[PDB]
């Protein structure tokens, strides 16, 4: 089997991407944030505290003839950005882009933090990291990908995120028309439950490439590119007037600037992030200070190749017995 679904930016900055997902019978379509940095599929639901729902589409298990309470199971998750959610668990039929999993754990939110409530466009998350990170207790549950894997033509999914445009998540096949040149594959460590890999270095603009190992995670659920302070300082030093602002919470730059590109290494290959991808616009409406898309990972504890990086590539998440990651230009 295979599946193919379009993923769409939630706003003009590509702050996140949503992908329609069919849950239950008859289908209830919710727009979920596919997140390769976590491993829970959770939704706004008829059980979500009413004051914490503000425009989201909800899953109502009682209206699904295939929903079954997973008795005794609860979940609770906290994300890197400080947001959180928790609740109980149903199993139900879940389809993405024509690919169907029966008996998928669908985690129904009873509570969500303010960041989720305030984002009316995201109806939940669909985690695509390794199932060892799944938070369901007392019986950990498998991700959608893990459940689908055996049925897939090939045990892979791909992320092809757009810049200010829709893109595609494919399951079970590599669309050879969706990228240019070749796909460069690189080793993955699953020790922390993430799609963790080591970039071979970076360049800023037309500058020379610096060969240096940068361990980080491929994370579709993180907006920005978080890298070591040394690397980030070297980038922003090439933008006149750029500075790190503790008050704003990172590097900002004059909105009048033209940003340089940023290149990262994948083995001997190179992925170029155009400067425009690094512009996250005015810090507040009407401001001439703009927020940078490359930020320090210091004090996150891990480097994160988020959407800023991934949307510059066609990315293969290979879930073979020995997982790997592939990157191609596009």
* Cα–Cα dist 231/199, whole Å: 12
Resolution given for this structure, in angstroms: 1.3
Pick the CATH number of 5-174 from 2.40.70.10, 2.40.50.660, 3.30.360.10, 3.30.70.20: 2.40.70.10
Among candidate residues 199, 261, 296, 297, the one labeled active-site is 199
Catalytic-residue membership of 35: yes
φ/ψ bin of 103: left (φ > 0), alpha (ψ from -120 to 50), beta (otherwise): left
Cα–Cα distance measured from residue 109 to residue 235, given in angstroms and rounded to the nearest whole number = 40
CA atoms lying within 13 Å on the CB side of residue 305: 31
3-state secondary structure of 109: strand
Indicate the DSSP class of residue 137. B
CB 85 within 8 A of CB 110: no
Rounded CA separation 238/241 (Å): 9
- Please tell me the distance from the alpha carbon of residue 22 to that of residue 94, in angstroms, as a whole number: 6
Q: Please give the distance of CA 178 from its chain centroid, rounded to a whole number.
A: 19
Break the chain down into helix, strand, coil percent, rounded to 5: 10, 45, 45
CA angle 133, 135, 136 (to 5 degrees): 130
Nearest CA to 96 out of 42, 142, 34 is that of: 34
In the residue annotation, 199 being an active-site residue is answered as yes
Strands (E), 44-123: 68-78, 84-96, 99-112
For the record, the structure tokens of 77 come out as 């998750």
Tokens, residue 80: 């890197």
Structure tokens at 103: 């008996």
14, 49, 53, 221, 279 from 113: Cα distances, Å: 21, 11, 10, 16, 27
Nearest CA among 115, 120, 110 for reference residue 54: 120
Active-site residue, selected from the candidate residues 35, 119, 219, 279: 35
CA atoms within 13 A on the CB side of 16: 20
Strand order in the sheet with 303-305: 269-273, 262-266, 196-204, 210-218, 303-305, 225-227, 294-296
**Residue 25 CB neighbours (<10 A):** 13
Token reading at 146: 């893990």
Please name the fold of domain 175-330: Cathepsin D, subunit A; domain 1 (2.40.70)
Total residue length of the chain: 330
All residues at 6 or more sequence positions from 104 whose CB lies less than 8 Å from its CB, including other chains: 41, 91, 92, 93, 94, 144, 147
> Dihedral (C-alpha) 176, 177, 183, 187: value to the nearest 10 degrees?
-60
Number of helical (H) and strand (E) elements in the chain, helices listed first? 4, 24
Q: What is the DSSP letter of 259?
A: P
> Residue ranges of the domains in the chain?
5-174, 175-330
Q: Which long-range contacts (CB under 8 A, 24 or more apart) does 237-245 make?
A: 238/204, 238/205, 238/207, 242/292, 244/296
Q: How far apart are CA 214 and CA 227, in angstroms?
A: 8
Phi, psi of 229 (to 5 degrees): -55, -35
C-alpha distances out from residue 26 to 2, 51, 59, 124, 143, Å: 21, 27, 11, 19, 22
CA distance from start to end of the chain: 25
- Residues 94, 79: Cα–Cα separation, whole Å: 23
The answer to whether 130 and 191 are in contact (CB under 8 A) is no
């Amino acid at each position: 089997s295979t599946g193919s679904a379009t993923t769409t930016p939630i706003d003009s900055l590509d702050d996140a991407y949503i992908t329609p997902v069919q849950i239950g019978t008859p289908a209830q379509t919710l727009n979920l944030d596919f997140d390769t940095g976590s491993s829970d599929l959770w939704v706004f639901s008829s059980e979500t505290t009413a004051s914490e729902v503000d425009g989201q589409t909800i899953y109502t298990p009682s209206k699904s003839t295939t929903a079954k309470l997973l008795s005794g199971a609860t979940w609770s998750i906290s994300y890197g950005d400080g947001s959180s959610s928790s609740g109980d668990v149903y199993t139900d039929t879940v389809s993405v882009g024509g690919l169907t999993v029966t008996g998928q754990a669908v985690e129904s939110a009873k509570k969500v933090s303010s960041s989720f409530t305030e984002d009316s466009t995201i109806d939940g998350l669909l985690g695509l990291a390794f199932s060892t990170l799944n938070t369901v207790s007392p019986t950990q549950q498998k991700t959608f990908f893990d459940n689908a894997k055996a049925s897939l033509d090939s045990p892979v999914f791909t992320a092809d995120l757009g810049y200010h445009a829709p893109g595609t998540y494919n399951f079970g096949f590599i669309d050879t028309t969706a990228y240019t040149g070749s796909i460069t594959y690189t080793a993955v460590s699953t020790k922390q439950g993430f799609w963790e890999w080591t970039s071979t270095g970076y360049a800023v603009g037309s500058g020379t490439f610096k060969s240096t190992s940068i361990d980080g995670i491929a994370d579709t659920g993180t907006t920005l590119l978080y890298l070591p302070a040394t690397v980030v300082s070297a980038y922003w030093a090439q933008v006149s007037g750029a500075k790190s602002s503790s008050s704003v919470g990172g590097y900002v730059f004059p909105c009048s600037a033209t940003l340089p590109s940023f290149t990262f290494g994948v083995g001997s290959a190179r992925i170029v992030i155009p400067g425009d991808y690094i512009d996250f616009g005015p810090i507040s409406t009407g401001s001439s200070s703009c927020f940078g898309g490359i930020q320090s990972s210091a004090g996150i504890g891990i480097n994160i190749f988020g959407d800023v990086a991934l949307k510059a590539a066609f990315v293969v998440f290979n879930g073979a017995t020995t997982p790997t990651l592939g990157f191609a230009s596009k």
